[PDB]
Amino acid sequence: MTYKLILNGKTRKGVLTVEAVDAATAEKHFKQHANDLGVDGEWTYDDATKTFTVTE
Ligand SMILES: [Cl-]
Ligand SMILES: [Cl-]
Ligand SMILES: [Zn+2]
Ligand SMILES: [Zn+2]
């Protein structure tokens, strides 16, 4: 499935997507991105849109 990431960092914002066999695979992918970009925050998921948000 294709999953989305909304970046709501204090300094750094965007929307990334990733196709992954399951949500856990996509989400580990997306956490790696927030980590490497220097965005650390609270995470929440919206099942109906397959969209994670990270809010710093
Ligand atoms: Cl797919
Ligand atoms: Cl990506
Ligand atoms: Zn897929
Ligand atoms: Zn990626």
Tab-separated table of C-alpha atoms and ligand atoms in Angstrom:
chain	number	residue	atom	x	y	z
A	1	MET	CA	0.000	0.000	0.000
A	2	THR	CA	1.144	3.601	-0.301
A	3	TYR	CA	1.457	5.432	3.004
A	4	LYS	CA	1.983	9.129	3.615
A	5	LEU	CA	3.975	11.140	6.106
A	6	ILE	CA	3.073	14.710	7.020
A	7	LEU	CA	6.017	16.563	8.525
A	8	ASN	CA	4.876	19.169	11.004
A	9	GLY	CA	8.266	20.077	12.399
A	10	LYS	CA	8.889	23.417	14.015
A	11	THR	CA	11.485	24.189	11.349
A	12	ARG	CA	11.034	21.587	8.609
A	13	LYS	CA	7.786	20.559	6.893
A	14	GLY	CA	6.637	18.316	4.031
A	15	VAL	CA	4.692	15.290	2.845
A	16	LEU	CA	6.518	12.105	1.957
A	17	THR	CA	5.037	8.869	0.662
A	18	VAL	CA	6.259	5.281	0.663
A	19	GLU	CA	4.869	2.047	-0.741
A	20	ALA	CA	5.296	-0.829	1.686
A	21	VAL	CA	3.983	-4.376	2.238
A	22	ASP	CA	2.503	-3.297	5.589
A	23	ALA	CA	2.106	-0.253	7.775
A	24	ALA	CA	4.903	-1.259	10.106
A	25	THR	CA	7.363	-1.438	7.220
A	26	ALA	CA	6.243	1.941	5.939
A	27	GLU	CA	6.310	3.454	9.390
A	28	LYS	CA	9.855	2.339	10.223
A	29	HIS	CA	10.790	3.887	6.892
A	30	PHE	CA	9.125	7.149	7.880
A	31	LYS	CA	10.576	7.306	11.371
A	32	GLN	CA	14.023	6.877	9.823
A	33	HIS	CA	13.317	9.979	7.731
A	34	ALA	CA	12.166	12.121	10.661
A	35	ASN	CA	15.267	10.992	12.546
A	36	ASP	CA	17.692	11.793	9.725
A	37	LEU	CA	16.075	15.196	9.105
A	38	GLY	CA	16.319	16.207	12.745
A	39	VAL	CA	12.565	16.276	13.374
A	40	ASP	CA	11.561	14.631	16.631
A	41	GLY	CA	7.947	14.795	17.734
A	42	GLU	CA	4.732	13.038	18.588
A	43	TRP	CA	3.337	10.581	16.054
A	44	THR	CA	-0.257	9.731	15.169
A	45	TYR	CA	-1.835	7.683	12.408
A	46	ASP	CA	-5.026	8.121	10.385
A	47	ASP	CA	-6.162	4.735	9.083
A	48	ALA	CA	-8.746	6.082	6.644
A	49	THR	CA	-6.061	8.060	4.790
A	50	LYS	CA	-3.047	5.791	5.511
A	51	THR	CA	-1.368	8.965	6.739
A	52	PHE	CA	1.025	9.354	9.642
A	53	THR	CA	1.746	12.767	11.116
A	54	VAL	CA	4.767	13.768	13.192
A	55	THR	CA	4.311	16.975	15.189
A	56	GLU	CA	7.321	18.567	16.877
B	1	CL	CL	0.625	-1.356	-3.426
B	2	CL	CL	9.860	8.457	1.079
B	3	ZN	ZN	1.740	-2.000	-1.657
B	4	ZN	ZN	11.772	7.315	1.747
